[PDB]
């Protein structure tokens, strides 16, 4: 259970002059303009969610929401990219897709609450190593994945820890729900987290696009779940949709993390993909262009054109940053 001093250090932070709901919100500046960035990161998620009125509508008390955010924070490690700031960023970004991009019309209010909560658990206990690393090294989590027949090594791990956090009534943000609602909350959270495995990127993307070939049915379960998976995925790959100074800082962080994995693979005598090679060097600009061309740009263009017209800015900023990385060359 959380200490009173730990809760007070977060509770006391407010943002009257910095709008945490804006598409231009700068998390790097929020971290850099305080001596307690992990407390400010937790307060951003706390104030964003209480500010929405969503937890209150689903019987999640302020204290339970805070206990939950701090329990999540405790399970994030000191790695360059997959740290607590990434999930706070994903939470904030998804909030913009829902309420600035109008995707809230495509989901129920409960599903919006579930998605924002899911953003905070989606990478619990990441060590800055991808799924492939655990399998190539025969690490315990890889062995567990292989034996249990689940190829999403880390995503299943993230689900286990999410369920553990929520098993404590004092951090159960779904504790105010009952019956079908409570079942939907756990089921949707788990499916959203499992949808973040990038080995399944094209699978989830094309499954969504095909269900959207026939008129979107907001009355349908599969339709809303696929929208939730697509929005979780969109937040995960949203660093390319931000202002350049921000998008560049995310690129630096992911590069440093990837390079540390590559150094660990070199030390262990396992295969190193060029993207993870520290000593060998690739231009940051080349890496981001590749990521945009083969992953981010087709994903956002396709989801915007099929249904998410309000998220058109994601397509525009991706091109703006892509053209900026071309100039950096
Ligand atoms: C800010 O830039 C990036 C942010 C996140 C990612 C992710 N990639 N993937 C894979 C990596 C393999 C190749 C394509 C498929 C995506 C993941 O599974 C990560 C975890 C989940 C979601 C996306 C994350 C990648 C980025 O730049 C890549 C370009 N590179 C890599 C090194 N530098 C650089 O610019
Ligand atoms: Mg992940
Ligand atoms: Zn993530």
User: Rounded distance, CA 311 to CA 316, Å?
Assistant: 10
Q: Which helix (H) or strand (E) element contains residue 281?
A: none
- Residue 79 sits at φ, ψ, to 5 deg, of -115, 160
- Say how far residue 296 (Cα) sits from the centre of its chain: 15
- Say how far residue 174 (Cα) sits from the centre of its chain: 19
Alpha helices in the chain (DSSP H): 4-11, 27-32, 37-52, 54-57, 62-74, 84-99, 109-121, 131-136, 140-148, 153-166, 179-194, 201-211, 221-236, 244-268, 284-291, 297-306, 312-328
Query: Is the distance from the beta carbon of residue 96 to the nearest atom of ligand 1 less than 6 Å?
Result: no
Report CA Rg, the chain: 19
CA angle 253, 77, 130 (to 5 degrees): 65
Query: Is the distance from the beta carbon of residue 131 to the nearest atom of ligand 1 less than 6 Å?
Result: no
User: Rounded distance, CA 107 to CA 88, Å?
Assistant: 21
Ligand 1 atom 32, closest CA: 255
Cα 236 to averaged position of ligand 3 atoms, centre (Å): 5
Q: Is 219 helix (H, G, I), strand (E, B) or coil?
A: coil
Cα 258 to averaged position of ligand 2 atoms, centre (Å): 13
Query: What is the per-residue DSSP string for 108-155?
Result: -HHHHHHHHHHHHHTTTT--S--HHHHHHTT-HHHHHHHHHT---HHH
Query: Which of 198, 246, 288, 292 to mutate for ligand 1's pocket (most ligand atoms within 8 Å of CB)?
Result: 198
Q: Is 83 helix (H, G, I), strand (E, B) or coil?
A: coil
User: Rounded distance, CA 78 to CA 83, Å?
Assistant: 6
The DSSP letter of residue 103 is G
Cα 249 to averaged position of ligand 2 atoms, centre (Å): 19
Is 223 noted as a catalytic residue in this protein? no
- Residue in the block written with tokens 């655990």: 134
CA angle 257, 234, 46 (to 5 degrees): 80
User: Which residues, at least 6 apart from 315, have a Cβ–Cβ distance to it below 8 Å?
Assistant: 297, 300, 301, 304
User: Rounded distance, CA 99 to CA 174, Å?
Assistant: 22
- Residue in the block written with tokens 């509508």: 57
Q: Are 226 and 207 in contact (CB under 8 A)?
A: yes
Q: Given in angstroms, what resolution was this structure solved at?
A: 1.7
Q: Name the token pair of 96.
A: 């913009």
How determined?
X-ray
Angle between helix 37-52 and helix 109-121 axes, rounded to 10 deg: 170
Q: Are 243 and 260 in contact (CB under 8 A)?
A: no
Query: Residue 27's closest CA among 84, 89, 113, 96?
Result: 89
Q: Name the token pair of 194.
A: 């499992």
Query: Residue 288's closest CA among 245, 316, 248, 260?
Result: 248
- Residue 75 sits at φ, ψ, to 5 deg, of -95, 5
Give the burial string for 221-257 (b: 16+ CB within 10 Å, else e): eebbbbbbbbbbbbbbbbbbbbeeebbbbbbebbbeb
Q: Name the token pair of 73.
A: 């924070």
- Residue in the block written with tokens 């660093």: 239
Query: Is the distance from the beta carbon of residue 152 to the nearest atom of ligand 1 less than 6 Å?
Result: no
Q: How many CB atoms are closer than 10 A to CB 121?
A: 25
Q: Are 315 and 101 in contact (CB under 8 A)?
A: no
Query: Residue 193's closest CA among 115, 258, 267, 261?
Result: 115
Cα 124 to averaged position of ligand 2 atoms, centre (Å): 8
User: Rounded distance, CA 135 to CA 142, Å?
Assistant: 5
Ligand 1 atom 33, closest CA: 255
Q: Name the token pair of 185.
A: 């909350």
Domains of the chain, first to last: 1-329 (1.10.1300.10)
Query: Is the distance from the beta carbon of residue 287 to the nearest atom of ligand 1 less than 6 Å?
Result: yes
Half-sphere CA count of 55, side-chain side, radius 13 A: 23
Give the burial string for 292-307 (b: 16+ CB within 10 Å, else e): beebbbebbebbbebb
Query: Is the distance from the beta carbon of residue 285 to the nearest atom of ligand 1 less than 6 Å?
Result: no
Annotated binding site: 82-86, 122-123, 236, 288
User: Rounded distance, CA 174 to CA 172, Å?
Assistant: 5
Distance set, CA 46 to CA 160, 181, 289 (Å): 23, 22, 34
Cα 29 to averaged position of ligand 1 atoms, centre (Å): 22
Q: Cβ-count burial of 215 within 10 angstroms (0-12 exposed, 13-18 middle, 19+ buried)?
A: exposed
Residue 288 CA: nearest ligand 1 atom is 35
The DSSP letter of residue 167 is T
Q: Name the token pair of 329.
A: 């060359």
- Residue in the block written with tokens 């900026």: 324
User: Rounded distance, CA 209 to CA 304, Å?
Assistant: 10
User: Rounded distance, CA 84 to CA 202, Å?
Assistant: 27
Annotated binding site for Mg(2+): 123
User: Rounded distance, CA 28 to CA 215, Å?
Assistant: 40
Question: In residues, how long is the chain?
Answer: 329
Active-site pick, 82, 126, 158, 223? 82
């Amino acid at each position: 259970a959380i200490t009173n001093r730990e809760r007070e250090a977060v509770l006391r932070i407010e943002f009257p002059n910095v709008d945490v709901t804006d598409i231009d919100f700068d998390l790097f500046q929020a971290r850099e303009s305080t001596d307690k960035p992990l407390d400010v990161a937790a307060a951003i998620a706390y104030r964003l969610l209480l500010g929405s009125g969503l937890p209150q509508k689903f019987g999640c008390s302020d204290e339970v929401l805070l206990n939950f955010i701090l329990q999540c924070r405790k399970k994030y490690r000191n790695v360059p990219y997959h740290n607590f700031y990434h999930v706070v960023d994903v939470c904030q970004t998804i909030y913009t897709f829902l309420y600035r991009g109008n995707v809230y019309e495509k989901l129920t209010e409960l599903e919006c609450f579930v998605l924002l909560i899911t953003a905070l658990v989606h990478d619990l206990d990441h060590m800055g190593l991808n799924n492939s690393f655990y399998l190539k090294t025969e690490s315990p989590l890889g062995i567990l994945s292989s034996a249990s027949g689940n190829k999403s090594v880390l995503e299943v791990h993230h689900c286990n820890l999410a369920v553990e956090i929520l098993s404590d009534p004092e951090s159960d943000v779904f504790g105010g729900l009952e019956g079908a609602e409570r079942t939907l909350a756990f089921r949707s959270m788990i499916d959203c987290v499992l949808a973040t495995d990038m080995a399944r990127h094209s699978e989830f993307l094309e499954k969504y696009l095909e269900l959207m070939k026939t008129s979107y049915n907001v009355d349908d379960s599969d339709h809303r779940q696929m929208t939730m998976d697509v929005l979780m995925k969109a937040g995960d790959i949203s660093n390319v949709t931000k202002p350049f100074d921000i998008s560049r800082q995310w690129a630096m962080a992911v590069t440093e993390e990837f390079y540390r994995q590559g150094d660990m693979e070199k030390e262990r005598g396992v295969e190193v993909l060029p993207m993870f090679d520290r000593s060998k060097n690739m231009e940051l600009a080349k890496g981001q262009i590749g990521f945009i061309d083969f992953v981010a740009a087709p994903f956002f263009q396709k989801i915007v054109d099929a249904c998410l017209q309000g998220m058109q800015w994601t397509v525009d900023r991706t091109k703006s940053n892509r053209a900026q990385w071309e100039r950096v060359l």
